[PDB]
């Protein structure tokens, strides 16, 4: 038996939705089929070189042309449900950018620090 | 059953019939499958036949436990 979910193995949806390599966050509770073990390298390399062939007749992962990069997949956020298009079970995985509040010094600051005109096409600008 | 649902529970904490989808164009609208839409087609067809006055032939009225 494997550690990654059986829907990751073979997508629960009829069209094989949610199949392939899904990288997970370290602090996330969900697990993925991306393992760098010497025994798990053959299947994870076949998923990149050849892909998975479904019963319906469509190649899900690596349809062709360009091989994906499994290491740069955004972290897994949930599991696919048949009712909706997607079911989110982990909200902390999705990063939420937030802006700091303004302050008397904040609206006075600038990107660069102050140390103590017609555009001309040039082949090289030193600084 | 006459609407067309097959699984009574979408989750262990809520029924499947009381699932109205948010975050979309239609908020509060109950979710319908293709089977639900086709069963509603059959129901509306039977209703329109009955309103016309001819024999209302509800295709699922002859549906028993063994089919």
């Amino acid at each position: 038996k494997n550690s990654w979910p059986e829907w990751m193995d073979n997508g629960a949806d009829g069209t094989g939705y949610g199949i392939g390599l899904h990288r997970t966050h370290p602090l996330s509770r969900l697990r993925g089929n991306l393992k760098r073990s010497p025994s798990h390298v053959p299947r994870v390399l076949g998923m990149m070189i050849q892909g998975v062939w479904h019963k319906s007749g469509v190649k899900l992962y690596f349809r062709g042309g360009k091989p994906p990069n499994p290491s740069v997949h955004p972290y897994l956020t949930g599991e696919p449900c048949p009712l909706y298009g997607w079911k989110v079970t982990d909200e902390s995985v999705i990063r939420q950018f937030n802006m700091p509040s303004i302050d008397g010094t904040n609206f006075r600051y600038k990107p660069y620090v102050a140390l103590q005109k017609p555009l001309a096409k040039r082949l090289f600008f030193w600084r | 059953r006459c609407i067309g649902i097959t699984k009574p529970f979408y989750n262990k904490t809520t029924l499947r019939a009381q699932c109205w989808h948010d975050r979309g164009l239609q908020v509060g609208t109950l979710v319908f499958s293709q089977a639900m839409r086709d069963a509603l087609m059959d129901l509306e067809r039977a209703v329109r036949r009955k309103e016309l006055g001819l024999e209302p032939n509800y295709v699922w009225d002859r549906w028993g436990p063994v089919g």
């Binding site: 059986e6 829907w7 997508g11 629960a12 449900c81 048949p82 009712l83 | 529970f9 499947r16």
Partner: peptide, 24 residues
């Protein structure tokens, strides 16, 4: 064999998504 031979509804596994059948 020369003669002709002449299907999983829930491939999610044993229990995934909607519960199947009555409990216990």
């Amino acid at each position: 064999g020369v003669w002709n031979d002449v299907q999983n509804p829930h491939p999610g596994g044993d229990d995934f998504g909607p519960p199947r059948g009555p409990p216990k």
